[PDB]
Amino acid sequence: SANNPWTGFQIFLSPYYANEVAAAAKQITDPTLSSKAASVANIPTFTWLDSVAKIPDLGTYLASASALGKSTGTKQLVQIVIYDLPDRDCAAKASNGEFSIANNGQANYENYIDQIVAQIQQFPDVRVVAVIEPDSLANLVTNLNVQKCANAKTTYLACVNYALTNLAKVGVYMYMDAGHAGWLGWPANLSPAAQLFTQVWQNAGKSPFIKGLATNVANYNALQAASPDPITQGNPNYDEIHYINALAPLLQQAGWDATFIVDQGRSGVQNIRQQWGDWCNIKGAGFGTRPTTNTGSQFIDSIVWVKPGGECDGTSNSSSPRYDSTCSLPDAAQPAPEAGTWFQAYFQTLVSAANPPL
């Protein structure tokens, strides 16, 4: 539409990802490859607020961004992921989320949002873009037969509503997570997805800050595939552009001029999965198209790097209480450490296999 949140702003580069990348690059022994790895610290990524413990760092990023903008004569933009629902990741086998429905989860979640809002409010010269709750509402389209999801449905809706309503009060531009082409882009899932997201948009007052949807977060699909990946058989929407161009008009018919952002951080290498359901540390992934508003689609505000490549998706150690057997499949890089922790060998392949090259 008219207002692309990124235009006119410089993105604040994550200091954390920068530190992870610098440490990683020092261990890469080929000098050229090390140089290209180090340059990844200059590529903007999203900061995941996956626990309350991340909020102090958010405040520092906002303050640092404010100062950097004043020094350079720029307006700065901080990119965050809201990722702390109670009973998080209801259809996964395992979850790291700190809150549970049964232990005051949604009061705890609303406190988490309030702490984030209180930080954002202090730095009104800094713009914030938030992805709202990966791996949440998409479950309410396809996974209500999963009892943890059925029992979490009202909490997921209430908590996402609280996040939208309260982050809008401090002017945050928001994209709700909407899975990917192989989740919600199946033709038959489009209408129930549109109905759900529209409901949610109407429940939070149609705020103009609720810009649309984020897709492919932490996944590996192409934005525009040269040929369909064999895992996509049966689904005409074999890449994110097909998904978005099929879903967006449904949202528009309700009067929501929804726009989209698409993760491409681990999309440089296609045709690397045995099945579309395989999501954990997919082996041979490469860094994909770097973030840009030059998306080549009417519906897409930006290509983004939401999941920071190199941070693990989940452990392959079946003795962990957080084990997920997805992470031991033939297409999952192994052995793999706990989710979120650095996976050095995986990062070096992301660098080596980047497409376009670094």
Side-chain angles (χ1 to χ4, degrees):
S1 353
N3 176 26
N4 183 320
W6 283 272
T7 299
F9 287 78
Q10 182 173 298
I11 303 162
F12 182 71
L13 291 169
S14 170
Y16 182 76
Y17 192 58
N19 283 153
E20 291 184 304
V21 165
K26 292 173 174 146
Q27 292 172 55
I28 293 175
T29 62
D30 179 77
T32 298
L33 189 64
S34 179
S35 85
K36 293 183 183 297
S39 80
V40 172
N42 304 320
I43 303 175
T45 59
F46 279 63
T47 295
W48 289 62
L49 305 177
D50 66 308
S51 73
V52 165
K54 298 294 199 75
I55 299 172
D57 282 306
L58 172 62
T60 78
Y61 298 170
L62 295 166
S64 299
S66 177
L68 182 62
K70 289 188 185 77
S71 299
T72 50
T74 59
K75 296 188 183 186
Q76 298 273 321
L77 184 161
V78 170
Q79 299 188 143
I80 67 178
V81 189
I82 307 300
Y83 186 53
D84 206 10
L85 285 169
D87 286 26
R88 208 175 69 196
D89 313 293
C90 58
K93 285 246 237 298
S95 178
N96 292 110
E98 67 188 331
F99 296 138
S100 64
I101 293 175
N103 184 351
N104 304 290
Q106 173 179 156
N108 281 329
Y109 186 83
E110 294 178 352
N111 182 251
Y112 155 88
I113 295 299
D114 291 347
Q115 285 184 53
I116 291 167
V117 168
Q119 287 285 3
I120 294 173
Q121 187 179 21
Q122 295 178 72
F123 308 98
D125 68 336
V126 176
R127 176 164 286 190
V128 179
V129 173
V131 169
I132 310 300
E133 296 290 349
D135 196 32
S136 69
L137 295 178
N139 294 288
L140 308 183
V141 181
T142 69
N143 296 338
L144 292 179
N145 60 137
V146 180
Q147 297 304 291
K148 186 172 176 176
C149 300
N151 290 330
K153 177 179 169 163
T154 57
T155 300
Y156 281 14
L157 289 170
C159 285
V160 168
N161 183 67
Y162 189 93
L164 294 168
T165 292
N166 285 285
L167 292 165
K169 295 174 185 173
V170 286
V172 175
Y173 286 94
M174 297 172 278
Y175 297 85
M176 290 182 280
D177 184 85
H180 64 86
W183 193 351
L184 303 185
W186 289 92
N189 291 339
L190 294 168
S191 169
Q195 290 174 62
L196 175 64
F197 293 122
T198 298
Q199 179 62 49
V200 168
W201 170 75
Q202 281 169 163
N203 278 337
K206 305 179 180 183
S207 173
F209 294 110
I210 305 168
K211 293 294 268 169
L213 303 176
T215 82
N216 204 52
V217 174
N219 206 280
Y220 311 87
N221 293 349
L223 175 55
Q224 181 168 249
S227 61
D229 186 321
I231 67 196
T232 69
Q233 286 169 76
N235 189 346
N237 297 322
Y238 51 82
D239 58 19
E240 298 300 294
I241 203 164
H242 281 79
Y243 170 30
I244 291 167
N245 279 329
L247 181 59
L250 311 182
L251 305 178
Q252 291 174 330
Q253 285 179 77
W256 185 17
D257 184 35
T259 56
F260 289 73
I261 63 180
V262 181
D263 199 350
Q264 292 284 280
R266 299 189 294 175
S267 293
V269 185
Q270 297 298 305
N271 298 2
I272 50 173
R273 286 172 285 187
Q274 293 293 295
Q275 299 282 273
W276 214 347
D278 301 351
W279 60 265
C280 183
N281 308 313
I282 295 300
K283 183 176 69 175
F287 286 125
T289 302
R290 271 51 104 190
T292 179
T293 63
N294 179 24
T295 67
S297 167
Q298 65 175 133
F299 299 124
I300 307 181
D301 289 341
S302 196
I303 294 167
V304 289
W305 285 15
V306 187
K307 169 68 185 187
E311 296 178 3
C312 194
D313 297 313
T315 186
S316 59
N317 170 17
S318 58
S319 301
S320 175
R322 310 287 182 112
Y323 180 68
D324 193 322
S325 63
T326 314
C327 301
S328 301
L329 297 180
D331 52 4
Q334 293 160 58
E338 293 286 334
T341 73
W342 192 249
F343 189 174
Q344 175 71 14
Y346 194 90
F347 176 76
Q348 181 173 308
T349 297
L350 282 167
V351 177
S352 186
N355 167 36
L358 290 159

